[PDB]
Design a protein around this ligand. Structure first.
Ligand SMILES: CCNC(=O)c1cc2c(-c3cc(C(C)(C)O)ccc3Oc3c(C)cc(F)cc3C)cn(C)c(=O)c2[nH]1
Ligand SMILES: CCNC(=O)c1cc2c(-c3cc(C(C)(C)O)ccc3Oc3c(C)cc(F)cc3C)cn(C)c(=O)c2[nH]1
Lengths: 110, 114
């Protein structure tokens, strides 16, 4: 499905987030083996990353805007829940999530 | 602060839907860390936020733009995810409310007026 809302999420929201200096830890799934995090997939049951969201927008996976917005939300929430409050990654996620919300405030109404 | 079409939608549509939700009660007022016996709360959460504060701010025309009110809702949810354990029920309550917040925000009027 291709709606004006999903087009905006792809061309405005994803475009702004993908290129952000803090985006690199979120562009691909968390490689728990490489990172040495054996409890990752035990705590995070729904892993999500921008690369998966990007691939989904490119292959018209979503039916509604709300579904893509929930995937961005899952990615940020996974980060806050798994990591320690003082981890830099939490600050990086918060910075990107603020941009996500600022952009979503201007999204088409459908 | 001013009265925009988007700020009106956040008050009459978004806040209206969230305030009355069965899972809203722990979010209607600030986290009472003294009553809860949580001495580390204000050490980890430096920007406390709750729906009651957001509601009072919408009622008193505190915000200049919808994006500012949306950031306060986001701070409230993020504070919950960061402070609590992954398995705490409060995290599930916050996630349920945040999904409604995002569903409602998707239907907000696109352009901000006055
Ligand atoms: C409880 C401890 N948690 C972690 O260690 C942890 C690490 C990570 C990473 C992450 C992913 C990658 C690649 C590109 C391989 O994907 C690379 C580095 C990453 O993190 C670091 C960052 C951002 C800066 C550093 F100086 C060092 C590291 C390790 C992503 N996400 C979303 C996480 O939630 C997460 N948690
Ligand atoms: C790591 C430990 N974390 C907590 O203890 C914790 C408690 C809380 C509360 C919260 C606030 C209040 C009042 C009105 C007094 O403020 C009352 C109960 C609350 O929680 C409970 C709920 C929802 C159901 C229960 F069966 C029991 C409790 C305690 C709110 N928020 C947003 C939190 O993030 C939070 N974390």
């Amino acid at each position: 499905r291709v709606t004006n809302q999903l087009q905006y999420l792809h061309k405005v929201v994803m475009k702004a987030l993908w290129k952000h200096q803090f985006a690199w830890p979120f562009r691909q799934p968390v490689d728990a083996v490489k990172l040495g995090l054996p409890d990752y997939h035990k705590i995070i049951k729904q892993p999500m990353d921008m690369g998966t969201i990007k691939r989904r927008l490119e292959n018209n996976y979503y039916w509604a805007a709300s579904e893509c917005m929930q995937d961005f939300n899952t990615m940020f929430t996974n980060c806050y829940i798994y990591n320690k409050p003082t981890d830099d990654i939490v600050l990086m996620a918060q910075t990107l999530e603020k941009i996500f919300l600022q952009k979503v405030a201007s999204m088409p109404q459908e």
